[PDB]
Design a binder for these strands. Structure first.
Lengths: 56, 110
RNA sequence: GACGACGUUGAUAGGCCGGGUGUGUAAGCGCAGCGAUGCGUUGAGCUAACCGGUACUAAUGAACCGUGAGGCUUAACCUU
RNA sequence: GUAACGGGGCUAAACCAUGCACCGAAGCUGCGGCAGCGACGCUUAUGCGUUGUUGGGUAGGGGAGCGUUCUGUAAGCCUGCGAAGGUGUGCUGUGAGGCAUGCUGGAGGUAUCAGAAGUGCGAAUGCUGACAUAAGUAACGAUAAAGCGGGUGAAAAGCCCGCUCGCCGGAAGACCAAGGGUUCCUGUCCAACGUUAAUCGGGGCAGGGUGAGUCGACCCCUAAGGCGAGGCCGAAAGGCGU
RNA sequence: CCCGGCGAGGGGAGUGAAAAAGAACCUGAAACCGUGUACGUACAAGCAGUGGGAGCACGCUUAGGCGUGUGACUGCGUACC
RNA sequence: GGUUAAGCGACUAAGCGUACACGGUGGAUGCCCUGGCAGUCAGAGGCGAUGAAGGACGUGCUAAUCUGCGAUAAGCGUCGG
């Protein structure tokens, strides 16, 4: 139920070796607006594949 | 030449913030800003704010250029903690800690 | 986490078309009866995960990682 | 789980008798150093030339020392040309220790020989403060339930407005006593407080709000019971009662 | 004066002998938590040290084969009260 | 120099350990005293129905608390310094 000995700081780091997160490898560029956006996502200005989706 | 910006007494544990900090170490400022924009963490907003301030300081005080800057150093330090009381069952009381941290960003033309 | 299929030079998922299956004669209108109801149109209407088909909708051009002929010694071979 | 030579493995690497070599301890010898106790040189305020011999150790007895704070010596001596304290390096004694010096620090420190003690910490489920571990794990308090448009804003699943959906309805609606004591209304702010965010709040700050001859209290009258002039009783205090 | 939400918190300028004396303020030790550099570590079993010891890095040196950090491999070794 | 075969063999660090340099957290140590402790030599040994000890509420150019004061309310008359 509870520990019998105090784990060391070395053990704590070992368990934490899989906690690192990964950044986005790359992001797309719109064909018409020219701004950067996530792939398969709407741009900040409301463009998508140079079609000018609703930007309300 | 090196420029420094800090944010002290931030409401977040050092362990949580350190995850974001390791993501942009050694990268260029232009690339670093893009990475922080598309990270879904609260600490990303805090770190991005500090990095922008450091960039502004370079131009006004040192007259540097954006194209030549990169994140030379970055680290997070623990700050003071706040003590609180949380009632539990059967009349027992517990202690709660609300940790803070210090964020430092160094940008240089190296 | 992993593993398998597919991304327009395309049937991967939804929708749509036809069929099957289940339930058991819809609504509207007409007729008989004082009325509750019955009868005709009618095995009618509706129908999830199933079967056979179909580019109507979504699967974007790119970008990123990974390189540039691959150590030394000895023997037999190229030149048994 | 081989499990009745420690293991390989051995027909000698087994057993009996005889002989000669070698390995093997902090035992013995060789070389250098320290200390205790004896006798001798009658040396010597005692150290030696010598000279023999001894030196594991709990309870416990005997002998000799280091360092810390305070008083005299001290109206002395060191110090802004850098004191105490903190942190490194070099040298030195058998030990507790001592000496010099770089950096930090920015005003006190103290020889020698004597004197006096709140004089030395790892343990007592010791006392007070600070910080770890489990761990970014459990949990976020009734399974009555939410969806979308517009507005404000640095930022909206939670705030404001509108249209739908769901729940209580002898209450989860309305008015009071007891108790609490500004939580009531308006403007403004988001650090802390709210188990998340917050532009919102019973949160922070400032201003405003409670109008009685008839409602209630006070007031007149008494129940249980309390107090009680004289009085009766009891060491004192005090008890009962008209 | 500049970044930020007319924020919080910072970077310059200025004052002062000193701002690493900035109001969370003299001196600023330890536990505990981080960034940078050198060396070691993914076929090896146990109080983590001790004796021996290769290689690498670095400072010296009239190469004087020494000093400092690290420690592959190997003998012995079951904390304290 | 080429092909094949056999033997041998550096460069990896997701993370971790030791040493050194520079920081964070925390408030020990040194220095400091308008506070305490123990005495000596002198005082005075009581206050109150002429309303006490101790309190409530008020009082300023004044929102709060402390000190003083009492509707004559951080004060009034007189005699001296």
């Amino acid at each position: 139920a509870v520990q019998q000995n105090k784990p060391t700081r070395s053990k704590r780091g070992m368990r934490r070796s899989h906690d690192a997160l990964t950044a986005v490898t790359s992001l797309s560029v719109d064909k018409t607006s020219g701004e950067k956006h996530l792939r398969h996502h709407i741009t900040a200005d409301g463009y998508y594949r140079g079609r000018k989706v609703i930007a309300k | 030449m090196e420029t420094i910006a800090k944010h002290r007494h931030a409401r977040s544990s050092a362990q949580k913030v350190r995850l974001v900090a390791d993501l942009i170490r050694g990268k260029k400022v232009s690339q670093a800003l893009d990475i922080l924009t598309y990270t879904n963490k609260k600490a990303a907003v805090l770190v991005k704010k500090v990095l922008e301030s450091a960039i502004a300081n370079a131009e006004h005080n040192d007259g540097a250029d954006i194209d030549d800057l990169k994140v030379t150093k970055i680290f997070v330090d623990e700050g003071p903690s706040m003590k609180r009381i949380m009632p539990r069952a059967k009349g027992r009381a517990d202690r709660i800690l609300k940790r803070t941290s210090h964020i430092t960003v160094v940008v240089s033309d190296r």
